[PDB]
Paper text:
To unravel the mechanism of molecular elasticity in such filament-connecting proteins, we have determined the overall architecture of the complete C-terminal immunoglobulin domain array of myomesin by X-ray crystallography, electron microscopy, solution X-ray scattering, and atomic force microscopy. Our data reveal a dimeric tail-to-tail filament structure of about 360 Å in length, which is folded into an irregular superhelical coil arrangement of almost identical α-helix/domain modules. The myomesin filament can be stretched to about 2.5-fold its original length by reversible unfolding of these linkers, a mechanism that to our knowledge has not been observed previously.
First, we determined the overall architecture of the complete myomesin domain array, including Ig domains My9–My10–My11–My12–My13, from crystal structures of a total of three filament fragments: the My9–My11 triplet, determined at 2.5 Å resolution; the My10–My11 doublet, at 1.9 Å resolution; and the homodimeric My11–My13 triplet at 3.5 Å resolution. Remarkably, all five Ig domains of the myomesin filament are connected by α-helices that are identical in terms of orientation with respect to the preceding Ig domain, and they form a substantial, structurally highly conserved Ig domain/helix interface with an area of 350–600 Å2. By contrast, we have observed neither a common interface nor a similar orientation for any of the My–My domain-connecting helices and subsequent Ig domains My10, My11, My12, and My13. As the overall geometry of the IgH segments is rigid, the limited variability in terms of arrangements of neighboring My domains originates from the diverse helix/My domain connections. Whereas long six-turn helices are found in the My10–My11 and My12–My13 connecting segments, the corresponding helices in the other two connecting segments, My9–My10 and My11–My12, are slightly shorter, with about four turns each. Because of the smaller length of their linkers, My9–My10 and My11–My12 show limited direct interactions in their respective Ig doublets, whereas in the other two doublets, My10–My11 and My12–My13, the neighboring My domains are too far away from each other to form an interface.
Author numbering: 1246 to 1446
The structure:
Amino acid sequence: TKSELAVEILEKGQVRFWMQAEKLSGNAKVNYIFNEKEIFEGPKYKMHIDRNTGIIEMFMEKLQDEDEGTYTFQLQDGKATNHSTVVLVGDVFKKLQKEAEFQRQEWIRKQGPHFVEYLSWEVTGECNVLLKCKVANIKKETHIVWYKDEREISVDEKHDFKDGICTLLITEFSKKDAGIYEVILKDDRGKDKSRLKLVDE
C-alpha cells in the first residue's frame, strides 16, 4: 500500500475517497464497506480503479448526516489481501460535510449570475447614500431586482455587461430610507441574493 484510504473534497464539492496500492494486476477485486455493510455503485457511490497508478477511488456528490461513520476498501489481488479504513466521525466528518456543501453551492452559484462583492453603502453628493455591489456572469436576459422591505424599487435597466457594478442612489438620505435592502440576480442559469440592513440611529 502506497497510501491508506483518505477523503478529500474536490472541485464542485465532490467527495473523493481514495487510496493507492503499490501495484495492481488488472485482476484485483475491491469491496467497498460503510459501517460494516457493503456498498455498491449507483446513484450514491461511483467507483473507479486505475490499473497503472494503483489508485482506487470512490466518489460521492455530498455527505448526508447518515453518512457519518467508518469506510473500508477491501482489496484482493491474487493471494494478497489488504484493507484500508478511514473513520469519518466527529469534527472531521462535520468539516468534510460543510466543506463539500460550501464548495458545491459556490460552484453552482458561479455558473449563473452572482455577486463578487455583496451590498455595501457609501455617502456621495449632497448627503445622498449610494448602495453598491459587484456582480459577475450577467447576461442580457438576467433580471436584476432591487427591494426595500420586500417591496420592489425600480432602477434603470442597463446592464449591457457581464461583470460590473450595480448601484442604487438614495437621494437626501433620512430616517424613511432605513430598512432591509436586497438585490436579486436571476435567470434560467441560477439565482443569487444580497442583503443590507440600513439603519439610521
